[PDB]
Amino acid sequence: TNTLQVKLLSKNARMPERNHKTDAGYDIFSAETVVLEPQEKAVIKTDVAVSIPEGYVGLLTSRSGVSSKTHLVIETGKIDAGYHGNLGINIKNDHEDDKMQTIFLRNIDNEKIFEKERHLYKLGSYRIEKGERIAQLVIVPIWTPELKQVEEFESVSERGEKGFGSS
Amino acid sequence: TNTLQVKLLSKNARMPERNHKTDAGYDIFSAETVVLEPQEKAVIKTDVAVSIPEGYVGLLTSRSGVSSKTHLVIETGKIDAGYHGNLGINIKNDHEDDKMQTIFLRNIDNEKIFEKERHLYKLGSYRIEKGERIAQLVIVPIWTPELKQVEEFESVSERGEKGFGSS
Amino acid sequence: TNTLQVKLLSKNARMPERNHKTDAGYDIFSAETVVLEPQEKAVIKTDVAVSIPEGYVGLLTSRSGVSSKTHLVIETGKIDAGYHGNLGINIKNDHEDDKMQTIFLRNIDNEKIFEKERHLYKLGSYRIEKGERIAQLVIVPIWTPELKQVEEFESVSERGEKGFGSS
Ligand SMILES: O=c1ccn([C@H]2C[C@H](O)[C@@H](COP(=O)(O)O)O2)c(=O)[nH]1
Ligand SMILES: O=c1ccn([C@H]2C[C@H](O)[C@@H](COP(=O)(O)O)O2)c(=O)[nH]1
Ligand SMILES: O=c1ccn([C@H]2C[C@H](O)[C@@H](COP(=O)(O)O)O2)c(=O)[nH]1
Ligand SMILES: [Mg+2]
Ligand SMILES: [Mg+2]
């Protein structure tokens, strides 16, 4: 009732963790090491399942550090109540593909990764390490009413049909 | 009270549909056939209006299939209580514009569209078909208090001024 | 209790404003003038602090006008209850870097900015002016339960492990 069921699907999974006791979200960790080149897309596995109860939705979203410092973009996942599969981090390296080469991959803090064994990478490539903190899960109540088709609404609003307005 | 008013604005509109009875969102369908080239932006019409009541906001957001499989990016629309206009899907084909040509448009499952009448397209172009399911609407309660300007807050938090932290 | 504490951190700050009395969000204004070139990223300062109470999260998100009309992309910030720092607008000019030059910067309505003193800019560059309305803050209640690790969930759902489905 004030409890959320969490299922760890492999040895690579980490239990989600809340930094401060009043923060919104539970930190989410990668269960896989992946390199993403510029423009490359992936669904990164967490090997974590949850059982969000009816009346709620999970928002599987970015962290402020990773999104602001790198070109790694996470599309917010709407995690349905009842979904018991592996939580997937839906991600793109949105660094441009400019055809330049470099010796340095970048980590999720945008720091150059110095390797003893030197290799050539596409400029703007990132490595995500297993066990790194790349997303968070925030759970929010939802309203799911019956839909009633109408020809006209039962009240006239101040806003009306106005949208996509200027600044 | 557990009812949402929905107004269909044309013959091309489809009534929004919830897949599972505990899912968060109502599937939203395009009322238009559009081709989007790489980097092209549009507001796609649903020809659907709704009357979200005070105390709530609608989140007009992506589906997991379309966002993960294509370069089609939907910016989450915050649908105001009282807004009675046509719901617009705010979208970009974020495929890079690399100047390559192809015979194949892609659908929203990222499958090549085979045509009897062959044409040249920009590589990374998508067609969205009228009646296709490209977004969803999730409704969430909101807190809208009066704002009280202060010189200092009435409590000291654990978090304090910390933000945009590392991993 | 129906009150939100707001702290103005400088003379460049503006008090957040709700357009209609039933709208979801409080408009948020830039405290800085910045030019963003294609692919450039920034955290734009508002010089505004807030004290979101426990049980809520702030969503610092785009406006419909700016996102639909420009290539300026704002990543939704999850503003923690207790965070008392300067609200940062996490932004990218996602206009492609095509190496073309122009005399015209664009404003956030995507209008060309005519200058008496003519200068060369990168095509797709935007200027954000201090005091312009570029984001909004929507506050939403959250559920933050204790996590209970399990080997199997206490109910079988209709959805099950299904996710990232087709259209
Ligand atoms: O970023 C995401 C988005 C969705 N899902 C899963 C959980 C959702 O309940 C399910 C939705 O799938 P469709 O309804 O789009 O098929 O996919 C994820 O794991 N991560
Ligand atoms: O993706 C979106 C975003 C907004 N709107 C509409 C409904 C909102 O209430 C209204 C907000 O317009 P402004 O307040 O930004 O002018 O625009 C949409 O239809 N789709
Ligand atoms: O777009 C954003 C995202 C986050 N934050 C601040 C407020 C949050 O509480 C804090 C989170 O920082 P980390 O927990 O990611 O370190 O950063 C912003 O000001 N703007
Ligand atoms: Mg891009
Ligand atoms: Mg979002």
Tokens 């050539």 label which residue? Answer: A120
Over A44-108, what HEC string results?
EECCEEEECCCCEEEEEEECHHHHHHCCEEECCEEECCCCCCCCEEEEEECCCCCCCEECCEECC
Evaluate whether B58 touches B96 at the Cβ level (below 8 Å). Answer: no
Query: Is A82 within 8 Å of B43 when comparing Cβ atoms?
Result: no
CATH of the domain at C44: 2.70.40.10
CB-CB neighbors (< 8 A) of B165 in chain A: 64-65
Please give the distance of CA B5 from its chain centroid, rounded to a whole number.
Answer: 20
- Centre of ligand 5 to C-alpha A114, Å, is 34
Helices (H) and strands (E) in chain A, counts: 1, 16
Evaluate whether C19 touches A160 at the Cβ level (below 8 Å). Answer: no
- CA–CA separation, C150 and A103 (whole Å): 44
SS3 content of chain C, % helix, strand, coil (to 5): 5, 40, 55
Query: Is A94 within 8 Å of B94 when comparing Cβ atoms?
Result: yes
Round the CA-based radius of gyration of chain C to a whole number and report it.
20
Round the CA-based radius of gyration of chain B to a whole number and report it.
20
- CA–CA separation, A114 and A112 (whole Å): 6
Ligand 1: which of A48, A52, A54, A78 to mutate, most ligand atoms within 8 Å of CB? A78
Out of A39, A57, A107, the one facing B24 most closely (by C-beta) is A57
How far C119 CA lies from chain A's nearest CA (Å)? 25
3-state secondary structure at position A148: strand
Give residue C8's identity as a one-letter amino acid code: L
**Phi, psi torsion values for B67, nearest 5 degrees:** -60, -40
Nearest alpha carbon, ligand 3 atom 20: C88
Resolution number, Å: 2.3
- CA–CA separation, A73 and A84 (whole Å): 24
- CA–CA separation, C22 and C14 (whole Å): 21
Residues shown for chain A: 167
3-state secondary structure at position A141: strand
Distances (CA, A) of A73 to A83, B52, B86, B133: 23, 30, 29, 23
Beta bridge partners of B29: B133
- CA–CA separation, B58 and C155 (whole Å): 29
Beta bridge partners of A93: A72
- CA–CA separation, B4 and A52 (whole Å): 24
- CA–CA separation, C1 and B145 (whole Å): 8
Structure tokens at C94: 């996602």
* C69-94 core/surface letters (b: 16 or more CB in 10 A; e: else): bbbbbbbbbbbbbbbbebbbbbbbbb
3-state secondary structure at position C65: helix
Please give the tally of structural domains in chain A: 1
- Centre of ligand 2 to C-alpha B34, Å, is 21
Domain residue limits at B153: 1-167
- Give me the residues near ligand 4 (ion), CB cutoff below 5 Å: A 94; B 94; C 94
User: Half-sphere exposure of residue C43, counting CA atoms within 13 Å on the CB side?
Assistant: 16
Evaluate whether A112 touches A121 at the Cβ level (below 8 Å). Answer: no
- CA–CA separation, C101 and C119 (whole Å): 10
- CA–CA separation, C89 and C134 (whole Å): 9
